[PDB]
Enzyme design. Structure first.
Site, short mmCIF file in Angstrom:
data_model
loop_
_atom_site.label_atom_id
_atom_site.label_comp_id
_atom_site.label_asym_id
_atom_site.label_seq_id
_atom_site.Cartn_x
_atom_site.Cartn_y
_atom_site.Cartn_z
N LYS A 72 30.69 -22.97 -88.06
CA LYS A 72 30.79 -21.56 -88.35
C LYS A 72 30.74 -21.23 -89.83
O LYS A 72 30.53 -20.11 -90.27
CB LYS A 72 31.99 -20.96 -87.64
CG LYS A 72 33.36 -21.34 -88.15
CD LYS A 72 34.37 -20.57 -87.31
CE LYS A 72 35.72 -20.45 -87.98
NZ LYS A 72 36.53 -19.52 -87.18
N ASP A 73 31.05 -22.31 -90.64
CA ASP A 73 31.03 -22.21 -92.09
C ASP A 73 29.68 -22.49 -92.72
O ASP A 73 29.56 -22.21 -93.96
CB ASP A 73 32.10 -23.20 -92.71
CG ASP A 73 33.48 -22.77 -92.30
OD1 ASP A 73 34.00 -21.65 -92.40
OD2 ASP A 73 34.19 -23.78 -91.96
N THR A 116 44.64 -12.18 -89.75
CA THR A 116 43.25 -12.70 -89.77
C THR A 116 42.50 -12.02 -90.85
O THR A 116 42.56 -10.81 -91.19
CB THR A 116 42.56 -12.51 -88.33
OG1 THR A 116 41.19 -13.03 -88.60
CG2 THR A 116 42.42 -10.99 -88.07
N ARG A 120 35.03 -10.19 -87.82
CA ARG A 120 34.61 -10.42 -86.40
C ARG A 120 35.84 -10.26 -85.56
O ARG A 120 35.91 -9.49 -84.53
CB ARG A 120 33.89 -11.75 -86.17
CG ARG A 120 33.80 -12.18 -84.68
CD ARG A 120 33.27 -13.60 -84.64
NE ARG A 120 34.31 -14.54 -85.11
CZ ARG A 120 35.29 -15.04 -84.40
NH1 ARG A 120 35.56 -14.75 -83.11
NH2 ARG A 120 36.14 -15.90 -84.96
N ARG A 121 36.99 -10.91 -85.86
CA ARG A 121 38.20 -10.89 -85.09
C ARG A 121 38.84 -9.50 -85.21
O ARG A 121 39.32 -9.02 -84.15
CB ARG A 121 39.18 -12.01 -85.50
CG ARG A 121 38.63 -13.41 -85.13
CD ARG A 121 39.58 -14.45 -85.72
NE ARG A 121 39.30 -15.74 -85.15
CZ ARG A 121 39.43 -17.01 -85.65
NH1 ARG A 121 39.80 -17.08 -86.95
NH2 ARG A 121 39.09 -18.05 -84.97
N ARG A 138 44.73 -15.85 -95.43
CA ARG A 138 43.81 -16.87 -95.95
C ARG A 138 44.56 -18.21 -95.97
O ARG A 138 45.80 -18.22 -95.95
CB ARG A 138 43.37 -16.50 -97.37
CG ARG A 138 42.38 -15.35 -97.51
CD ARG A 138 41.07 -15.72 -96.90
NE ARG A 138 40.61 -17.09 -97.14
CZ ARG A 138 40.15 -17.64 -98.28
NH1 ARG A 138 40.10 -16.91 -99.42
NH2 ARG A 138 39.77 -18.92 -98.38
N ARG A 144 48.45 -21.35 -92.84
CA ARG A 144 48.53 -20.09 -91.97
C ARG A 144 49.69 -20.22 -91.01
O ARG A 144 50.44 -19.22 -90.83
CB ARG A 144 47.14 -19.93 -91.31
CG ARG A 144 46.04 -19.56 -92.27
CD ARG A 144 44.76 -19.42 -91.45
NE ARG A 144 43.63 -19.02 -92.24
CZ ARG A 144 42.84 -17.97 -92.07
NH1 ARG A 144 43.12 -17.15 -91.03
NH2 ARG A 144 41.78 -17.68 -92.79
N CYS A 231 30.39 -15.68 -92.72
CA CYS A 231 31.78 -15.43 -92.38
C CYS A 231 32.35 -14.08 -92.79
O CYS A 231 33.41 -13.63 -92.30
CB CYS A 231 32.68 -16.51 -93.11
SG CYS A 231 32.22 -18.17 -92.58
#
Ligand SMILES: *Cc1[nH]c(Cc2[nH]cc(CCC(=O)O)c2CC(=O)O)c(CCC(=O)O)c1CC(=O)O
Length: 296
Positions: A72-73, A116, A120-121, A138, A144, A231
């Site tokens: 995804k990165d 988050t 997207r989320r 972050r 996190r 992202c």
């Protein structure tokens, strides 16, 4: 040469990924000597490809042979001479709801704080529950989880794959179905980048390519390429192989969840790339263009 040097980020999750690639290479090629070259990325400190740029410089200057990333990165564009050549078997691609005090998203009271930094989320959660407060978060997975445990957030959203690979399956209160939180492109898969003219390295890597996963991620990435995504944008892109066909779903949303553009395509595996591009043009023609403009 009988040596393969692996460039990777240095967090617990990035090293788990590097070890998984190293184990698979040793299982296929027992005489190879695999070395690790861990390095920080811009992403770790604060063009784009924030989680990959230093890795790619390593390859261009022959300091490493392959760079291992969470798919995804990986950005949709690459410096000339580099490319993504192997996509490993996909793990659970879903988002996870993580909370100490609540059992599900429905149990949070109005005003609860969800962490988050993914638009997207955020767009998807804001669409369903405009009463929740979505605050940027972050940091590596353990950083996190600490901020949650310190009470700075009521819940946070992370990828299920990251938590499972770290042995933190118990922090998953609920895996969110793709219909509630559509995954980011390639979520759950590890990708390997290398020098395209390096045929020795490319041959050693072939045994690690997972065909079905490569077909899925090809379609997801073709969509994102056309939208010029990454992202930092509110894009969901997710493919499943269902009865011999690829089923692609995509979304582009306004971060406040006011407007979300959705689309889907079904087709033969051989058409994965063209299906993604077609889907992306349907979204752009439907208002995705303006939502992204207001982002970028
Ligand atoms: C594409 C995308 N990447 C991330 C965040 C990300 N990628 C790597 C890391 C470090 C993970 C670790 O090694 O433990 C991270 C986390 C970070 O540095 O802040 C995101 C953001 C996810 C979020 O904040 O919810 C995205 C966007 C996306 O998934 O939609």
């Amino acid at each position: 040469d009988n040596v393969l040097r692996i460039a990777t980020r240095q967090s617990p999750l990035a090293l788990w990924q590097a070890h998984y690639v190293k184990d698979k290479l040793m299982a296929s090629h027992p005489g190879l000597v695999v070395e690790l070259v861990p390095m920080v990325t811009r992403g770790d400190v604060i063009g784009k490809g924030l989680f990959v740029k230093e890795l790619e410089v390593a390859l261009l200057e022959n300091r490493a042979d392959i760079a291992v990333h969470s798919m995804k990165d990986v950005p949709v564009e690459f410096p000339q001479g580099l490319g993504l050549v192997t996509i490993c078997e996909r793990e659970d691609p879903r988002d996870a709801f993580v909370s100490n005090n609540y059992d599900s998203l429905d149990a949070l009271p109005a005003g609860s704080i969800v962490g988050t930094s993914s638009l997207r989320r955020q767009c998807q959660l804001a669409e369903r529950r405009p009463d929740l407060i979505i605050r940027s978060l972050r940091g590596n997975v353990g950083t996190r989880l600490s901020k949650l445990d310190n009470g700075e957030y009521d819940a946070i959203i992370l990828a299920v794959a990251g938590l499972k690979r770290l042995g933190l399956e118990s922090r998953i209160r609920a895996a969110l179905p793709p219909e509630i939180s559509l995954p980011a492109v390639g979520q759950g898969a590890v990708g390997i980048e290398c020098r395209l003219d390096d045929s020795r390295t490319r041959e050693l890597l072939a045994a690690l390519n997972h065909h079905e996963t490569a077909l899925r991620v090809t379609a997801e990435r073709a969509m994102n390429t056309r939208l010029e995504g990454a992202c930092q944008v509110p894009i969901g892109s997710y493919a499943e192989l269902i009865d011999g066909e690829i089923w692609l779903r995509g979304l582009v949303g306004a971060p406040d969840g006011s407007q979300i553009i959705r689309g889907e395509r079904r087709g033969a595996p051989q058409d994965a790339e063209q299906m993604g591009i077609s889907l992306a043009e349907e979204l752009l023609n439907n208002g995705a263009r303006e939502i992204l403009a207001e982002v970028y």
